[PDB]
Amino acid sequence: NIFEMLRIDEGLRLKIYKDTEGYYTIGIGHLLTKSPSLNAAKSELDKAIGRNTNGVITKDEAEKLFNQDVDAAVRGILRNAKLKPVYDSLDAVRRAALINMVFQMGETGVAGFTNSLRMLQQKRWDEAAVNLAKSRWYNQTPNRAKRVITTFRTGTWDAYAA
Amino acid sequence: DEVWVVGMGIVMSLIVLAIVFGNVLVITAIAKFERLQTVTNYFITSLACADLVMGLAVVPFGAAHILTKTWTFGNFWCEFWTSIDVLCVTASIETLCVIAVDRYFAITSPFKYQSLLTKNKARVIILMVWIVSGLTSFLPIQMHWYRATHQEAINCYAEETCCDFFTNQAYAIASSIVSFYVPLVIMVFVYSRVFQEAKRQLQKIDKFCLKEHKALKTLGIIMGTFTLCWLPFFIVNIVHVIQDNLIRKEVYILLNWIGYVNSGFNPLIYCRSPDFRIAFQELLCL
Ligand SMILES: CC(C)NC[C@H](O)COc1cccc2[nH]c3ccccc3c12
């Protein structure tokens, strides 16, 4: 399912680390905070967790946080007036692809593509893919972009599992 | 492809069952029957133990890794697993080498075809084999001496869902030479001399049983097989040390798995011996 998708694309790390932006991140794609300070990240983390983690957390915990982030993700996608119509017209699969794009690029970032969303809502896949392939997101991470896009056109998990 | 993953699941399940079944058979036959108890079959017992640990501990998790296209067992068990793997292979080659040497010193002693070592010496030798094997496998792996310094390998190490073996050129070369090549050359030379001797005898006057020469042919078969299975793999290691990525990962994995499949060939090779055959058919209620 979707959890598997994200679990693959982003990846899962047991110990605190800095992401591609240099910000503090742990578990699957969970942002502790944006700051060079490890102490601020520790505060954020402990606030998200039950007790002091020192920066090390259990797989289970990581999954808990991932769930919180997915919840918050879905809520965000629903509240956004631009994204809402598109997400409602997409089947569970493409919905998952979308939730992926929102995990990586965030609400605003995803709302960045007007025509992509427009056609996704119009059930026109190929053209949409052609639009997403010329994007910045695709250029930055051509692998995840290619997989997600392929997921949009195919509407299947065949891109993440053979 | 779920259809593909199931097919592979069935194939590799048949593989694992074959390995476990066979080596278990060998060990049981060797341990139960007093007629089958000799230094040679003690070494064979060590070998079948190595291949057994290969069957239960390693192959299944590798299969799971390839099928699921990812590692679900966590870094800890990834590392320990690799340790188990290298340990097994090393112990195996060392065992075969020891066997070769034993046969050499046994054929050529004034009393011929007789091996000078009693039982408690053999056990000691095996124990030492496993000790130095785990010494050249676990230590380097548990001390993280193999680990590469590039960002890819580091990401794969810190990643719990990623199990991949990345080795700095140094570890690749050193470990592949010490754990494989040297004892290989040793075995080859020694056993070649053993065949030369066997031929210098068989043409000589009576009497020395042919069954023993057939046995030398059998052992020769075990060794030949092992070397032929693992050779392509250990060659490619040095290949990637010289020029890396000159060979596809898939191919690497393939040769790797050839080496794996080798672990189940021994039980079928021991059938050459009338003794092991009678024993086998005995345990099977035939
Ligand atoms: C798929 C992995 C985890 N298993 C690798 C090979 O089966 C055997 O590995 C070895 C056994 C003995 C000595 C060795 N030296 C090496 C150097 C590089 C890679 C593997 C080995 C190796």
Numbering used by the authors:
A (entry chain B): 1002 to 1163
B (entry chain A): 29 to 314
How is this structure described in the published paper?
The highest level of expression was obtained from the fusion with a two-Ala linker. The 3rd intracellular loop (ICL3) of β2AR is another flexible region and it is subject to proteolysis. This loop was truncated in the fusion protein by removing residues 235 to 263. Purified T4L-β2AR-Δ-ICL3 bound to the inverse agonist carazolol crystallized as small rods in lipid cubic phase (37% PEG300 (v/v), 0.1M Bis-Tris propane, pH 6.5, 0.1 M ammonium phosphate). Nevertheless, the dataset allowed us to solve the structure by molecular replacement. Each T4L has four packing interactions: 1- against ECL1 and ECL2 of its fused β2AR-Δ-ICL3, 2- against T4L of one adjacent T4L-β2AR-Δ-ICL3, 3- against T4L, ECL2 and ECL3 of a second T4L-β2AR-Δ-ICL3, and 4- against ICL3 and Helix 8 of a third T4L-β2AR-Δ-ICL3. T4L-β2AR-Δ-ICL3 exhibits ligand binding affinities for the antagonist [3H]-Dihydroalprenolol and the agonist isopreterenol that are comparable to those of the wild type receptor.
A factor contributing to the difficulty in obtaining GPCR crystals is the relatively small amount of polar surface area available for forming crystal lattice contacts.
